[PDB]
Amino acid sequence: GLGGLERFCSPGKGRGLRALQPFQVGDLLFSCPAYAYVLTVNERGNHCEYCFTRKEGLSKCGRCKQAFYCNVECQKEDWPMHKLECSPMVVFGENWNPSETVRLTARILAKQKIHPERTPSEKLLAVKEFESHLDKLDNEKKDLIQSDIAALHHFYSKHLEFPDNDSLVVLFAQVNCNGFTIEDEELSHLGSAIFPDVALMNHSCCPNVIVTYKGTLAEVRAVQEIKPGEEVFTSYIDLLYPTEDRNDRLRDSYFFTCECQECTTKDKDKAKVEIRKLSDPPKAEAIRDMVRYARNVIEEFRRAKHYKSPSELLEICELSQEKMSSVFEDSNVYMLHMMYQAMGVCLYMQDWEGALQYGQKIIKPYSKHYPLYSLNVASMWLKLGRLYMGLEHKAAGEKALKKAIAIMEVAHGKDHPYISEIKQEIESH
């Protein structure tokens, strides 16, 4: 197992992770090497395929020209996994498009063939023991898993000996339930991975730990004091949202309803959905209509980013914020969601001034809605600092970068390479 911790039966939460020793804020509970992992297509050339090191001058795989490495060692060590995609990418060419879930699942199957025994990533929970929620799957979810199974056979039949369709549905369901996205210091998606021992941790909306990444290594650090006998909880989702939104996401992706202190009390829901203090106060039904509109625009924008122009996308943000502002305060989470999306469009267009303009409005309400140590808060301070620094606003940049560092020292560890990079940014300018 893992020193100072143990697997146990958490009443109403299946299996969980329990502390057997105290942990203070910022302490590393444990580390978990990735069981299986895949670098996202859009990050190829930026990060090494094998170790996820972000560096310039990465060496290109000579055959496919679509995998990049630190050196010949990272190339060689990645070959058992890379071979699943190398020749297929050149052969299928433009037709090579498996989903990231399919790409990850092919790597799980390859790992099971090479290393059928328990790995150092499975000291407490094994990939084979993962919860699947197979019994909870409706026709729509089974059809999506069937599309994934067809893509797996379509792109990965060369090296893999597939189990029956039934075992593959269980696997795809286990991956959807237990898979992790690996994000960088700005919360930008790097890839997907399996961290079995990390997946043992149950969810809370008031977590006592944060998961961070050092290359492909998951690290688990306390963000609250943990005492012997206490269960170790991480957040599976974005904590900005009110109770109903959080539980709609938890039910849809994880098939459960949270009953943590935040979900039971609903204490933060009022400030999250802050209403304007108007002479004629807005009616209950008028609030409910705007909350419904707000959730609809969030979905509309999500679809629109796949095909609309940057000006059309900014229009959706501006127009929706205008409609919402008649009922909602600027600190309201639905207003903040659109501002964050608008900031993202500005960043893509390299409109640094516009991105800064939005980030300045988001920061104070973010700090209030998110927990004490939050990667979403750290990431926003970091973006702001980098924008300020890039725009020659050095004092404001330094202040915002130091706010990012203060949170990251707890979540990522004082010695994290990301913090050394941020300090170099403060020192170089």
Binding site: N176, T181, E183, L187, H189, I237, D238, N376, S379
Partner: peptide, 5 residues
């Protein structure tokens, strides 16, 4: 997948 953003 289990994330922040």
């Amino acid at each position: 997948l289990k994330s922040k953003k």
